[model samples]
Target chain A: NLEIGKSILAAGVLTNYHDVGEGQPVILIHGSGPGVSAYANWRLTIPALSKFYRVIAPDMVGFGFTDRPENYNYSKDSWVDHIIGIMDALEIEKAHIVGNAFGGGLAIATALRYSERVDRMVLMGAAGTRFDVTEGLNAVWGYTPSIENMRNLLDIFAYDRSLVTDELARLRYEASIQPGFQESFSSMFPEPRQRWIDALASSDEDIKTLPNETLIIHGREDQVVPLSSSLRLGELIDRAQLHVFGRCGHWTQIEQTDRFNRLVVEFFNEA
Target chain B: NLEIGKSILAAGVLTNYHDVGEGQPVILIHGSGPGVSAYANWRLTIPALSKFYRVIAPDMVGFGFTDRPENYNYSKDSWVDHIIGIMDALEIEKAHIVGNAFGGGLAIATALRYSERVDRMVLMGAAGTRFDVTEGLNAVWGYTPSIENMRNLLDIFAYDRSLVTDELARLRYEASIQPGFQESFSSMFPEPRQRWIDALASSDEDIKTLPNETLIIHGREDQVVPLSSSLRLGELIDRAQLHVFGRCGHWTQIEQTDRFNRLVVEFFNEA
Candidate 1:
């Protein structure tokens, strides 16, 4: 009923997720950006993808409207478990997973850990490997609530400066200051952020052997999570095919929304 | 030059290795057994495989005549790097890797980490997955230098008691007490062996996506490393084919040497 999304108890956390259309299930996992939510990440994606497949976009625990439990172990493992919990609650034995940046790492973990539960995988500007942390990532994690900070972060996110509007920054800044929003985001990736990047990364040993039919999408000019990370992934995963979008940044979904949607939908449509 | 085999400076350690025949290069990595060496593990294997491939068998750092540096890190990565160092030293661009038991885990890591350096992989009685340490492994690692202990170990190793001769036990026991042999073996896997098992095991996530055409060979009645380990590998790896030798124990190479040799040679012979 709410534009913010529907509520469901997933792994004991009251999870805020969206559900639309009907067919094979496709779960869209959002990135770990300050003020990020499921609707905010996949608002455009849902309409296009939902036309063919049942699109379920959920705000993972410690992000968006989802409940952040006390002393919750917010790790790749826990996040994977939450996604599994969501599927189990809805009686979905298997589903396609589309992950964005931070969520892309979670998608890889889920597919690897729970192989039988995943069908296909799509990773965009994915952060799932051990790489040197970038200035964009540093600014995102080291963010303090301010219009300027949010504006600067948006500029880092989008390669096309037109996307970094003043109104967009104000709206995002407002989301960042939501009660307990900055507190949780601040605590997640503290200083010496390289460890957090490593923590999110699945091992090179493990990544090389991923058997899932995968589609890797990255913005050629991405600075937030380094294009080289996906390049490494493309080299490591045998069945993976990489598609780089030029003139795009971390916001591949927004930068080239139509192409991104078409590519994903077409990928899912294949055998 | 000696019966202990040839010596070479590989990864800065004086590595004792065996090289024979002339054709496609095939490297044999021995298991982590008490007093074991390359010639001890692959005497039967090298002769059979060398007919088609130029076989190279080495005593990895920390085992046999290979010089174990005072502060050498005896880890899976170091071991894999040593194998790569050997390949680099010989100027061989790529080679088929044959690994037995502990060596099998190293082979998997090598193929995964250095995908381009390996052509094909063969794993026998492989210990590359985390499982509850078996009684036989406990007996092998917790071994004391005694004729009686060696006799019992030989019995545990082979299903056929006829193979467990006094001469064999005496020879193995003599090898166990050679200067610096028992010292390294005892220090390699001390009490609380489960951690060592876990440490040697590549992640299940990584194991599933191996792209190389892999041959997984195991003993049907293996007690040292359970047959389930290979069965699990067969399931995880997409291009893997598994063969279980009947009426066999952990000593697949020795107990069923003829069949093991033919199977491995045939596997490498394929495209």
Candidate 2:
């Protein structure tokens, strides 16, 4: 039921999302990993952030329980449109946004194209710049259904081996096989994964023009997305402060939850 | 005596500088106008800031009472070297720097070249970007020795005409004629004024890579330097915040003294 969460129609698709707490709204977006949903990616963050402000975590149209319309074209334009449509449905004139790897790209695109709608941004392991696709990312996009494969992938996602338990792998593996999950996942970025990086990337010229106050976070040892991506983002985007966590990997939200939450809250709270 | 301020040897030039207060050192750099000096530019600021910081205001080698070494090459590198030499002479490992107009360009050049020696930066009415030469700047640089010329220039500097009194112009006119002052001032940015803009400007690549926390202030009605320069800086620098003051001109420190001091103090004071 939590996975189903609450459903709302946005951009002609019935979207599944979680709306929590009170105060100024902050949107949470998930990464592009297999079986990943809004709840799955931000379950740790929402509760902590909700204590201070209103939090909205949405399962974007192409993934999770959101209706994956037959032959729905997936591109930056469509994704940005869906995000704005949700805001229109909720009548939120402006809000701060926090995004993970794939979601970070969307957050940047949203800010660039629709600047008046965004207040501030927090990017974690954000992927919105040009870089050679890593083998870890290749493996993530090329995932096939298996408990062993899922368990092995968890090793690549985190630096601490203890965090990847057999039971956790079993649940993730089960979630991956949910009806129509693999179909949409496989369709998003098949092979020649390098092109997807380009597709998700916002141009340097566009990023340079963005005036929004931004906080960029990355794991120094992240395997799925290189730290250089955030470095480049920090270099290009105006009014951005970058922080890299040592001995940490792609699971910044899961591994460094408390620090991440504190940073996000303080960043938004500061004048 | 106050106008003469303090004198110290820097880069083989006897420099006239102000050393006040007794805390974390903050170096104040003066603008490039006919009769400007560290004390003249920052006299109102030093006393207020000295309440919390050790303020250092310097008359650059070719300006004010600082001894002008005959045929001293005036370039970004030379100015930056002089600033570093002062820090070295003072036994200061690192310091916060505040600059006005021409001084802002030097501050940026210093940060780009010798990042290890500088901490936070505050650039007010800064000119460190490329733009077509404005007539106002051309007139200011092309000024001849006269009370009327100084009075006219002061009108262009401030939005409020009331600040440009007869006594202020008479005093500034006298400061301009002080031995060897006009000789160095005229030689610095002679005839082809457009080249000076390029000379003071830091490359986009260099500015993009700067990771220091920067606060950029500009006047909405500046006549000498365009507001677009500060906007471009706020765009390229990795960690920067831009503020534009209404009903203000090139004299942001003088015109908005209280607000300007508060911003500079708070910016360095904040975590």
Candidate 3:
């Protein structure tokens, strides 16, 4: 289990987040999953990125130990509002947003919605493209509330299936299956349910309209959000560049943590 | 302006809905928009279907004359809950469901979550499937709260651009640009914000588990939700069928009012 940290109450949501380092601000957002949390997604990323920029990784509205109100809207609107609320509470006017998978989609949206509030973006294995869902992703989003399913989903999430350890899957299963959480998680991902996710893929033209410099990174073997998404995104965003990690899947920061860190830092330092 | 009828209050949301006919019950849900309501979407279908079955077309929680909570979560979860809430309030145990676009996605979700409650479903230009955003769809979601934007969007939503009449566009624009509306509208659609929509897509393998019979309908040239989505869905659900109308766009009920009504009535009458 993860320990509690500094908390900020914004938009009626009590968010657990970390504010580290002191230079440029960088907000880290995680993808959607039963056990997906900012810390879970950005533990390795925050520490590494913090050495170069102040990293604020908050557990978004629904996931983590963050507040999941009995009746609250959970969408880009609420999520972004919670994010902006947190930023406002922290007096953060501008920041570089970095997201992985679900969070990647959020990062692009942040840049597009408030270009003045965002300086640059780092999207990894993002889910903002309009391709049919791949088999690997189907396994991840379709994961039911069970240990075996979690284990298998982890297997699908990594290019190196060997990385899906018994401990990791068990931990995620534990994080996911809380009494209120399991039901909401099930509610969030229902049958004919994944139907709402179609709207998640933003227009490529919208991505082109983003004024921020972008860095698109993907694990060539990413099964969650396809690599083609990043390839097409690289072509769409004028200042955007693409990077692929061989033998990597959705969890690039985990699979290629060191290289991912170096590349992001390099991109930020570019003149 | 649309006509209003009986009103029901459940879960702190007051729903304005039309109840006509006297046979089997059928619930109608509309798609998403700044000023979109059930009436505008099913003005034609409701009257026709009422001749054969009891039709309940409601202004879902966040849309139409229904109450919009200060910070309500407007996702499939709430929408389904609201539908069920209304059903429970009226003591409706089961009913046939017909949906368009966002409402289509909600209908599928309702089937998955409460199978016993859903007798059958008619999904027109339904918004399921795990594909990325198309340029046409992007335009639809990215529309701001303005007459020009609404006109552009109505033009994009219909195959026959001429169908986007001056009166229709102006009416929708007036409904959209209401007080406390533009802000919420912006929230509904943040900058390329459909990112939250990704989580809304349903899984095909799970869709196979739906016990309810379903009929999928789409226009050959659907600009919002793709026709291929319906085709793929026809193959996913166990007891599912598809019908495609050529030279049609997203608004199937309006563009092909008579044919659309006949097709739905026949499907619901299926043994």
Best by DockQ: 2
Shift in Å, residue B191, candidate 1: 64
- Model 1 residue runs over 4 Å out of place are A1-3, B1-271
Q: True interface contacts reproduced by each model, as a fraction?
A: 0.00, 0.00, 0.00
- Score chain A of each prediction against the true chain A by TM-score and list the results: 0.98, 0.98, 0.94
How displaced is residue B126 in candidate 3, in Å?
Answer: 0.9
TM-score of each: 0.51, 0.54, 0.50
Instruction: Order the candidates by TM-score, highest first.
Output: 2, 1, 3
Worst 10 residues of 1 chain A by lDDT: A238-247
Q: Report, for every candidate in turn, its global Cα lDDT versus the true structure.
A: 0.86, 0.86, 0.77
lDDT of 2 at B163: 89
lDDT of 1 by residue, A189-255 (tens): 9989999999989998998778887878887678898767876787677666565665678978898
Compared to the true structure, candidate 2 yields what TM-score?
A: 0.54
Q: Write the per-residue lDDT of candidate 2 for residues A11-78, one digit (tens) a residue.
A: 78899999998989999989998898999999999999999888999999788899999999988789
- Per-residue CA lDDT of candidate 2, range B1-271, in tens? 5789777998888988999999899999999999789999998899988999989998987888988887789998899999998888898888999989999999999988889988999988887888778888998899888999999899899878898999999989999998888999999999899999899988898888887888888876788888778767876775675656656789789987876787678678764
DockQ each: 0.01, 0.03, 0.01
Query: What is the C-alpha lDDT profile of model 1 across B2-94, one tens digit per residue?
Result: 438788998888888899999999999999878888888888878888888899999998888899788667888999999999999999899
The alpha-carbon root-mean-square deviation between model 2 and the true structure, to one decimal in Å, is 8.8
